[PDB]
Design a protein around this nucleic acid. Structure first.
Length: 518
RNA sequence: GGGGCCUUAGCUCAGCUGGGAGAGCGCCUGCUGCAGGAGGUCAGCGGUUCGAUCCCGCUAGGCUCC
RNA sequence: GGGGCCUUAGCUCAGGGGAGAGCGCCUGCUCGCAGGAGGUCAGCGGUUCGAUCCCGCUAGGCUCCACCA
């Protein structure tokens, strides 16, 4: 994991630099596992994101806008009761574990000064945000409850004593000498990267591989020097925030990862890196989890129809072959003088077959139309926003951008928005865009003659909100709205179009974010 | 006795009142919590029909009901 | 079964004159500010110049009774 003890150390330093002494002005919880503190510090308003998400747990200052629920969750209201209005006195790391502790001076209901500790544990699935009394060391509440049945060592419930996770009894990299490295590392046993992780606290396999790489030939002379150099870089805050992309897979770190043969992009801090790294990924997995019941249903219903098609086909084939039964009783009728119920039984098998052809063919066609419908829904679910999931659910039961030139671009992200955009909002000569033979979002430029740059920007947006968002070249069709038509009885969003031109674009998240009107 | 309702995968139940057998939990696999697996004569039996938990015929059994 | 009481905005409650106030939630402003959000006044049909506040009924929720052989 890229968010390791060393990364936590660097983040803790950055947070102290940015928000120590800062007043918590507002607390929000936009998502189930994500809390946002609005902090007034050093003449600036900072947004601190605290994520206890199983896959995307992180702490950083974020520029991103987040939509808050109409009703704040109970944990948010609890945090507001205890620590909103308070001052962050200190931020510290628990050893070199992935646990940040925010010391927050607040006032009680009577007005007396109280100190609260906010523990932010970054442990993947077990990641948590826990508020305690500093005097009594008693848990006020945690974002995730841990019952004694789930963990015998530590309980995370209101009114219980806060206990850290079990210590790993590992050496501190920030205090380690050359002799400490030489005593603990068996240079003959191999897997030196693993040995480093086993002996040194806070060190990931990513860091350990970098250390082994920088050593060149990892031996008793080279590896201790490489480790101490890397530890010194961390201890002295000589951070180079970077993301390295190797074969489509991104790695982020607080130091340069020379062991990775890929394109390295540097940053002024780590927030932007994490925003980019987890952009789409956190949402897609959450959507996948919420959609899993529908997908399993939709995929089943699609599969059902294909199977239905196959059987009907066999009844059509039976119908064709049945002609034999017509022969059988014709011949039996001709030769009666030389059994008749057997003739008639064959004939009847024929007629039943023959009559099944037209019904089978019709039922194959209808099952094919259902497969196409379900294939469209599967794609829509893959690129949907949270609102789009609601609109698709309603169907199953039954955004503004500005170009570089200053032209308004409108986007529908679901079937209902797509229908509303194309049929009610868009003017007759406005330019409509959509991905060719790839399900996606309807995009409309509010201009009859947009410049080529605006077309490419709008196409990039269309491709970004399509199934092909991860492809290097995506075909996007565009035409005037007057050429786009909803067929009679078609579901919302579904349209036929003519007189189209196709452009090819690479989807880019940064371009889409830059063009988004606030 | 008279009426009433259900029997479905390892387990428990969905499924519109034919549109093509599912979920949750447990279990098996790998990953680092995730997906993906298995698994049903839909109690059984036989009509209907292009497909039947689905419609009806036809018997189990258990509950509801005096 | 009968009596007795209840049903107002997210929440808590004001209130025959055309449905408010605080808090929450939104507006910009940083312990106060500054404007919004939101009502079939349980419902019904009627008294009338107007009904949340008449009056008669229907819901529902509580409450008290339903005994004597």
């Amino acid at each position: 994991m890229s968010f390791d003890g060393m990364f936590t150390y660097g983040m803790t330093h950055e947070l102290n630099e940015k928000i120590m002494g800062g007043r918590i002005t507002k607390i929000h919880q936009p998502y189930k596992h994500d809390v946002i503190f609005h902090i007034r510090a050093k003449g600036k308003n900072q947004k601190l994101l605290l994520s206890a998400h199983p896959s995307y747990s992180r702490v950083h200052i974020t520029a991103q806008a987040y939509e808050n629920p109409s009703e704040p969750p109970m944990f948010c209201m609890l945090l507001r009761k205890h620590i909103e209005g308070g001052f962050i006195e200190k931020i510290e790391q628990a050893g070199l574990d992935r646990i940040m502790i925010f010391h927050i001076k607040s006032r009680n209901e009577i007005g007396d000064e109280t100190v609260r500790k906010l523990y932010v544990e970054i442990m993947g699935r077990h990641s948590n945000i826990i508020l305690t009394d500093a005097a009594e060391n008693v848990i006020i509440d945690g974002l995730k409850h841990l019952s004694p049945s789930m963990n015998s060592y530590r309980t995370v419930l209101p009114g219980q004593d806060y206990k850290l996770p079990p210590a790993q009894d590992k050496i501190s990299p920030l205090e380690a000498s050359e002799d400490d490295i030489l005593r603990h590392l068996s240079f003959q046993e191999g897997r030196l990267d693993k040995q480093i992780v086993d002996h040194f606290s806070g060190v990931s396999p990513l860091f350990a591989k970098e250390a082994v790489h920088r050593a060149g030939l990892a031996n008793k002379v080279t590896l201790p020097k490489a480790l101490l150099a890397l530890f010194a870089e961390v201890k002295e805050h000589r951070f180079i925030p970077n993301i390295t992309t190797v074969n489509g897979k991104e790695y982020f770190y607080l130091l340069e990862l020379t062991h990775l043969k890929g394109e390295a992009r540097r940053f002024d801090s780590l927030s932007e890196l994490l925003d980019r790294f987890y952009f789409g990924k956190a949402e897609r997995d959450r959507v996948k989890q919420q959609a899993q019941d529908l997908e399993r249903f939709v995929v089943n219903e699609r599969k059902k129809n294909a199977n239905k098609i196959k059987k009907l086909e066999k009844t059509l084939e039976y119908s064709e072959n049945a002609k034999e039964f017509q022969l059988y009783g014709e011949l039996l009728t001709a030769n009666l003088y030389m059994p008749s119920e057997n003739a008639q039984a064959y004939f009847t098998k024929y007629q039943k077959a023959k009559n099944s052809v037209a019904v089978v063919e019709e039922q194959i066609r209808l099952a094919q139309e259902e497969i196409e419908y379900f294939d469209q829904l599967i794609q829509q679910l893959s690129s949907a926003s949270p609102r789009d999931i609601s609109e698709i659910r309603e169907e199953l039961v039954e955004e503004t951008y500005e170009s570089t030139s200053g032209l308004t671009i409108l986007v529908g992200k679901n079937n209902r928005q797509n229908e509303y955009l194309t049929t009610r909002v868009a003017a007759r000569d406005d330019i409509w865009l959509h991905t060719k033979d790839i399900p996606g979002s309807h995009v409309v430029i509010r201009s009859s003659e947009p410049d080529e740059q605006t077309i490419m920007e709008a196409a990039t947006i269309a491709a970004y909100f399509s199934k092909a968002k991860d492809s290097s070249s995506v075909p996007v069709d565009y035409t005037k709205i007057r050429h786009v038509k909803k067929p009679n009885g078609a579901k919302p969003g579904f349209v036929t179009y003519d007189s189209q031109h196709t452009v090819f674009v690479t989807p880019d998240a940064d371009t889409v974010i830059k063009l988004k009107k606030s």
